[PDB]
Design a protein around this ligand. Structure first.
Ligand SMILES: [Ca+2]
Ligand SMILES: [Ca+2]
Ligand SMILES: [Ca+2]
Ligand SMILES: [Ca+2]
Ligand SMILES: [Ca+2]
Ligand SMILES: [Ca+2]
Ligand SMILES: [Ca+2]
Ligand SMILES: [Ca+2]
Ligand SMILES: [K+]
Ligand SMILES: [K+]
Ligand SMILES: [K+]
Ligand SMILES: [K+]
Lengths: 361, 146, 361, 361, 146, 361, 146, 146
């Protein structure tokens, strides 16, 4: 053919390659921020050379990330112009494509800048209602929002899907008018592998939320309660399951927000788990047939065994009544009791077998 | 006691569920109508045999005095002289009814409480009402003589 | 038939009548116990004449109740002998009928006897772990178990069921080989009236549990926390829903046991409510058909409305390109954007229409 | 036709207009009450001209609302007389109609009257069990019940629905004998838009309950715990999800009632969400067919790949056993292990293929 | 660029899905096999018309050169030469393909954004290729002539 | 074929016998450990002869258990060689069979050795945040892990299953290609007896978890709160249902881990119970038919009763209007109201009858 | 205020559903189409009687003027001239509409509010339109005369 | 190392599952009876072929000695003499069995673990039983000769 399916291949490769460097430069800044935040508490201070040197490596990565995002959007514009018949870049701007670019820029543009700035922080302590005031730095405000950079992982995972760039899949979708969207992958995954995504999401949320809670609570905790990493892990775990708080109520609002988010996520995951358990218990045809066969055999055997005793007790009663002159009534009444028990057992087994048979028909 | 006036309408109300339009009789066509609505599709012989037993008059249909007697036995928690037949029909082949005498020997040795050989040896005595080795229910009615 | 169908009527009436006096004499003792327990705390003491006079009215009722129970069981024995062919009362004794009679006697034989006896009670207080010791009376031990007498209400309700004494129902059940047992009524009720039994049971449990908790907590509460009736109601309500305890933890094992029972009942009721809500929201055929009809009409109208705009924009573009010499490109690109939007909307509406149609077929 | 249809439209319009002014005059009083309650705490006092002037604007609105309600009921009576063919107006008075008019009058007649009245309020504090006594005003009692005026919004929403005032749907409703009731709209909405009503109801309940809780708790709170608006929001959120109370237990009964209501609503909403999630995970036919097609293709490829290795390992074993005289047993053992692994894998893939095929048939 | 060796094998895998017995031919019976497994039971004329358009050799079957061309149209996110056809077929009557010229006046003046009478008057006078009042798709081809 | 089938019987019997002595020697050590741990607290000390004598009986049992495990694995190797065609024991070692043997050895090799060793333990107290330091013994660390020896019960239960060693079921398994693996038994059990395994598992977990919690909490509890056996039982019960902690938060990580595990198990059991309740409420065909029959009869009777009143009221109106000259309008109004009520009731009953008839098909 | 512009157009939308293409003609074939999609498969005589009653012209179909009259009676909450018909057809014997005079005595004295013998005696003596003991429809129209 | 009395009775219970009339053998018509209850509806040839292999007497029915030998194969966890059959039948067309020798060249080289040309070259030169290009299962029995 030429051009088409030859040039379109190059655009796909360029778009796919540009989404990995962005992820690398997005994770590098997060890692450096975590190390700097951990080491700036006791190892050194904010007025040293280590802090400036280690925070000057975040701005460069942010600039590279912004450049990569802009190039990615330009290549997407080129692909859109190639796909639909058009010869002007101005046609794509539709008051919605512009907004998401600005949203991405604002989300990925936040980082702790070099310097030494401070502000005043006041909070009310739990279980005692006592005021507390400290002097904090503005870097804590500018570092937590950088966890929003995790949306790139979804894009990288989607662009690498085999069911996204397969010609046969496209042909079948055309034959069935299937809408291959960014959400259909989740719908398929919640069926093919419904027990792996839940575990991965739970562990990631657990670790990130515990670290964030401890980072908030370091400032106003002097008794090592909510500022301990294992304590934060336990608090997140018990809030996820909605058991309670114990004596681990935070003294800060950003801990309360994390706890509320964890509770909402836990409720949603519990509903999903209930649905999955309901869906995972029904039997297939083969095992059902085998079960019916074995049950029918067992019930037939039990029916014969129960039917023997009725005749046995009848014969015992008849032999013991009109024979050997005098009769001992104790044996007679015992045999009558056994006869009634045998009758009831036979009736019950017959009813159960007929019910099972009509159900299995 | 017998049956009081308020009890008269009680049975007629139940009798009206089988008497559709003042028929006064219980025929095969009406019986098949109610059975389909109860999840049953029996054969013609089954319903023919069912009405045959309760046809005391001989006109080929069920009457109210006949209906009263048959339903009275159904009120009992256990019909004593009916389960013995059911046990016999469990050990029955092709509806003949003539159970082989030698067959009873095996079933009493192991199936159940395992009666002794001498016990069934006396059991087979007087079991042969004639001396061939086949009994349909003459042993059963002999059991419930008194 | 008169010997059978006429005689059987008398036994049923005698059995039914004997179950109402038993209920009256069982409720009378409970009411008197509640009044005496309430009035013996502040109005008078256990060494007065009022206490002896008011507690001497419980023993007589208990004796009458025992006599009525024995007569009821004798009449049931007579009915069993009449029903199944037998002429010996000893045949019914089967090591199981004997046990339940003794169980009933022991359950209904407990009551606070007259006198003045005391014992020593020790408990650990909540949130402070401080020991507490008081002198109590043995009447508190002998009064709470009398709430077990409520099983008679189930018997009275069952014996009054229309679907339990009716010839037509018996004939149909015999035809269909169904079982008219003491459990089928519950399953039928959970379908015909699934929202009334839950409310009645919840209110009865609420009031009885609150009163019992307050009565147990009177002895070791000096600050009016768990000994207040409204506080007990609130504690029972919040334990039923499994929200927490707040500052209302009991200082006694009685309250702990009542709260555990309330939590178990609440979990069971929540599961039942979930199942009922699941089984309620489905639609019937008529509403489904009319909904499909209205949806089809609306989607057809929307299809026509969307299809008009494609032609409108195509004509606008064609008129604006090769006419009136010079052309303003801004208008052209605006109309191209509108054309693409119209195409996408039309495609979406067509897809939704086809999906709904194939689903409704 | 004439009077049958020409006049019937005028009555509907008159009834519809009268339901908007009522809503406006019902919301005006609520807004004024909220502003006056907020400003009477610190800005001015209940013995000033501002309070009297601002509370004199509620009585006039209440009188106008009562007049509008009476006119609306009179017009509904007129419509009922027209729609049935009766002549005397007295025929419509059927008790149930009379009772609801009085109920509406009593509900909408409550408001804080002008003046200056006080009463004595006492409560027990949480976690400390200490008595507290203050002097309050009667306006707090007369203002909270005015939130019951929100039932007018349902009426306004119902009267504006096209599915209720469309003459085309009447033919199908008559054909299918479907009951167009005031409740059917809710059942339809819980299917067409099941995720919007839940959000709207949750946000409205959240804000109203938080404001009411703070209004109760401001009287007996001196440490800024339960009288803070954000604290009230957090308490309502954590009670809705049934996680616990922490140290946020109210010292007042009207806070406890709001918490109990929030817990009940939360349980109901959780059940509904579980049902919705259960109903939202089913797959349609086209996607199911496409999934089956792709799975069959992949499984066939895997079957061929697994079947190759069996022959490969068999050939390797045969070449390594009866060739080049001396043989290394390690190679033979490794090849036998690989042969068994290949056999097991092939068997597993064949079983999975057959299971998928039979279940997809 | 054109197509690389890896890309060539990719189409063969998709080509093999319509060649159960090879032969490099896409016959009518083969379409019926795949469509039934995809929840479709179309008429013979539908598949006969479908293969007719995608056939350029004229033999009756479909070969790879025709298969390659039809895939490129599918890969496009929006075929601008088909949507106008669908809009016409929504208002089309009994498959004739010839729409009355007077009918378009109503659907343009009211349905949609209510185009003005003067503009739609210019539309019809330019679309009067027929000269009698029964327009067809011949207006579409001149719409996309450039 | 006599050689293969005759020999295969001996290996199965040898393998089955070796799994009972292992269980006996595994339970003996647990029992002795529990007795020694209970008696080493107050009766004697770790520097006595009783402790050495009673702990020297655990090492011998552990050695016997290890020998039995090794013999069992050797016999399993022999069975595998007999089953699949092979003549070398080295073929079975596949890097996975080796790993599980080592895992079993490490799990079953842990026990408290004789001696007297100590270490230092520090914890933070609940609700007070006060440090606590004690000196403990290393035997507490080496005794709790021995509860992992309970996996032998599953093996013993599986090897005794009739549906696992039945020759008749093999034909049906071949005909249906059903997998008789170690997981199918649970699937069958969760259907045949879904209410017994839950109870057994709940009681076992309850007792073991309460004992473990008390065993860890004995060291840092001086007020008899979390070191009391009944208190531990109540804490485990209320954590299982996810109600809260009250004032029973542990001061040790043992309690935190055990409570987390109990909460997870409780959530899973609640989901299973919800599914079971949903599965246990649908009706069978016979009872459904009987219910429909009775409902139809009752509805027909109600239809006739309602239809009589319309004619009755019409006749009353006609008699009271054009007769006896002068008329009283009050009677006319009352009769018209009753006429409308009868019409509405008849319409409602007809609608219910038609809906039931349309549904029951 | 009858031929209002918006309300007449609205009736056209409702009338367009039963109008196949452009004809004010509603026949037996049209009802079968609409009722089938609403889960209804009535007998041929059913809709034949249905269209017959709503027919005034006599051409065998339904006209637009006839549509207004039938719609008006359906918009009304309760038709007092059809409820008595329902109370008669529930007691209808076979379908001829003939109910014996003696039958009315029992259904009135017992079923319902237990009307007195004297009152029903005056009822029947006035209900005798001719003097045979069978009333079909004249009693209902005589009831609603004024 | 024998079959004890318990073992003998054990197989009879399994054997009684197929001997409905106690004939001492199984008829080919009752195979479909048990298979229908197991959700299987095979063709006549399938059941004819199945009984053909396990028929040693040659009369047309299966005896107990064949049944006893049948269970022994079932007891084995992996019958190594049938897995190669499965692999061959995967690469089999129209059930001929005459697998082309040139076809095996491609699959071994690419499909699987990528065997080399020199390795596969010795396979055909040894698998040529005659030298025509068609190979059969005689290669398999040659593989398992020792
Ligand atoms: Ca009859
Ligand atoms: Ca007769
Ligand atoms: Ca072909
Ligand atoms: Ca061709
Ligand atoms: Ca027509
Ligand atoms: Ca007409
Ligand atoms: Ca046979
Ligand atoms: Ca044979
Ligand atoms: K739930
Ligand atoms: K909870
Ligand atoms: K909780
Ligand atoms: K809690």
């Amino acid at each position: 053919i030429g051009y088409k399916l030859g040039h379109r291949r190059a655009l796909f490769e360029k778009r796919k390659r540009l989404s990995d460097y962005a992820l690398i430069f997005g994770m590098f800044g997060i890692v450096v921020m975590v190390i700097e935040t951990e080491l700036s508490w006791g190892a050194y201070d904010k007025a040293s050379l280590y802090s400036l040197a280690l925070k000057c490596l975040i701005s460069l990565s942010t600039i590279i990330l912004l450049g990569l995002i802009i190039v990615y959007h330009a290549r997407e514009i080129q692909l859109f112009m190639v796909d639909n018949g058009a010869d002007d870049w101005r046609i794509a701007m539709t008051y919605e494509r512009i907004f998401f670019i600005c949203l991405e820029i604002l989300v990925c543009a936040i980082h702790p800048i070099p310097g030494n700035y401070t502000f005043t922080w006041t909070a009310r302590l739990a279980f005692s209602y006592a005021p507390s005031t400290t002097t904090a730095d503005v870097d804590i405000i500018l570092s937590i929002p950088m966890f929003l950079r995790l949306y790139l992982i979804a894009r990288v995972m989607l662009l690498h899907s085999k069911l996204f760039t397969d010609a046969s899949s496209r042909s079948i979708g055309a034959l069935n008018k299937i809408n291959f969207n960014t959400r259909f992958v989740m719908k398929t995954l919640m069926t093919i592998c419904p027990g792996t995504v839940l575990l991965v999401f739970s562990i990631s949320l657990w670790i990130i939320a515990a670290w964030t809670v401890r980072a908030c609570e370091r400032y106003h905790d002097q008794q090592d309660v909510t500022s301990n990493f294992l304590g934060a892990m336990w608090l997140i775990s018990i809030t996820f399951l909605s058991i309670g708080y114990g004596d681990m109520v935070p003294n800060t609002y950003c801990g309360k927000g994390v706890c509320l988010l964890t509770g909402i996520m836990g409720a949603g995951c519990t509903a999903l788990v209930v649905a999955v358990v309901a869906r995972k218990l029904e039997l297939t045809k083969a095992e059902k047939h085998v079960h019916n066969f074995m049950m029918d055999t067992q019930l037939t055997k039990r029916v014969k065994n129960a039917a023997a005793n009725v005749l046995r007790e009848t014969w015992l009663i008849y032999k013991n009544t009109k024979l050997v002159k005098k009769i001992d009534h104790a044996k007679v009444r015992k045999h009558q009791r056994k006869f009634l028990q045998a009758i009831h057992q036979l009736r019950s087994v017959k009813m159960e077998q007929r019910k099972l048979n009509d159900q299995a028909n | 006691d017998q049956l009081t006036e308020e009890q008269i309408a009680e049975f007629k109300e139940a009798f009206s569920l089988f008497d559709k339009d003042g028929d006064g009789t219980i025929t095969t066509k009406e019986l098949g109508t109610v059975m389909r609505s109860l999840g049953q599709n029996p054969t013609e012989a089954e319903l023919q045999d069912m009405i045959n037993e309760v046809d005391a008059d001989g006109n080929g249909t069920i009457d109210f005095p006949e209906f009263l007697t048959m339903m009275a036995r159904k009120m009992k928690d256990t019909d004593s002289e009916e389960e013995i037949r059911e046990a016999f029909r469990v050990f029955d082949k092709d509806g003949n009814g003539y159970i082989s005498a030698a067959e009873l020997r095996h079933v009493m040795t192991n199936l159940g409480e395992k009666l002794t050989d001498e016990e069934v040896d006396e059991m087979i005595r007087e079991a042969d009402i004639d001396g061939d080795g086949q009994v349909n229910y003459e042993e059963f009615v002999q059991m419930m003589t008194a």
